[PDB]
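I am hoping you can look over what I have pasted underneath with an eye to the fold:
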Amino acid sequence: ELYENKPRRPYIL
């Protein structure tokens, strides 16, 4: 729904 795509693009790949 929101910007829940944060754990898909972690600071450390």
Observations:
- The chain has no helices and no strands.
- Residues 5 and 13 are 13 Å apart (CA to CA).
- The two ends are 23 Å apart (CA to CA).
